[PDB]
Amino acid sequence: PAAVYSLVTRTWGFRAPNLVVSVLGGSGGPVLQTWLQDLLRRGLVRAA
Amino acid sequence: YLDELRLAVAWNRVDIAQSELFRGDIQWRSFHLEASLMDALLNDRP
């Protein structure tokens, strides 16, 4: 993966990151209750 | 068939479309938008 990191940093115009969070879950696909939408709509985008 | 977005575009109120689109209670389909854009273009609602 050193090659693909060098690809993303060098060739394509992306800047090197400062913070890598990784959302990793499965709800199965119904609509989620409202405060989870508030959490992903306030905490993982404004900070990001 | 009467729906909500076409009735909102027939009026001039924007906040009804704001709440209906941004509200997460019902996931929106594609046919409603694809039909209602045709009525939005004709009556000059930019």
From Swiss-Prot, chain B:
Family per record: Belongs to the transient receptor (TC 1.A.4) family. LTrpC subfamily. TRPM4 sub-subfamily.
Post-translation changes: Phosphorylation by PKC leads to increase the sensitivity to Ca(2+).
Binding site for ATP 2: R29
Tissue expression from the record: Widely expressed with a high expression in intestine and prostate. In brain, it is both expressed in whole cerebral arteries and isolated vascular smooth muscle cells. Prominently expressed in Purkinje fibers. Expressed at higher levels in T-helper 2 (Th2) cells as compared to T-helper 1 (Th1) cells. Expressed in keratocytes.
Recorded consequence of changing A40T: In PFHB1B; atrioventricular block
Binding site for Ca(2+) 1: D3, E4
Written domain comment of the UniProt record: TRPM4, is a temperature-sensitive ion channel, it adopts distinct conformations at different temperatures, markedly influencing where and how ligands interact with it. Decavanadate (a positive modulator), ATP (an inhibitor) and Ca(2+) bind to different locations of TRPM4 at physiological temperatures or at lower temperatures.
Disease implicated: Progressive familial heart block 1B: A cardiac bundle branch disorder characterized by progressive alteration of cardiac conduction through the His-Purkinje system, with a pattern of a right bundle-branch block and/or left anterior hemiblock occurring individually or together. It leads to complete atrio-ventricular block causing syncope and sudden death.
Protein name, UniProt field: Transient receptor potential cation channel subfamily M member 4
Highest taxon above the source species: Eukaryota
Higher taxonomy: Eukaryota, Metazoa, Chordata, Craniata, Vertebrata
Function as written in the Swiss-Prot or TrEMBL entry: Calcium-activated selective cation channel that mediates membrane depolarization. While it is activated by increase in intracellular Ca(2+), it is impermeable to it. Mediates transport of monovalent cations (Na(+) > K(+) > Cs(+) > Li(+)), leading to depolarize the membrane. It thereby plays a central role in cadiomyocytes, neurons from entorhinal cortex, dorsal root and vomeronasal neurons, endocrine pancreas cells, kidney epithelial cells, cochlea hair cells etc.
Source species: Homo sapiens
Complexes and interactors: Homotetramer.
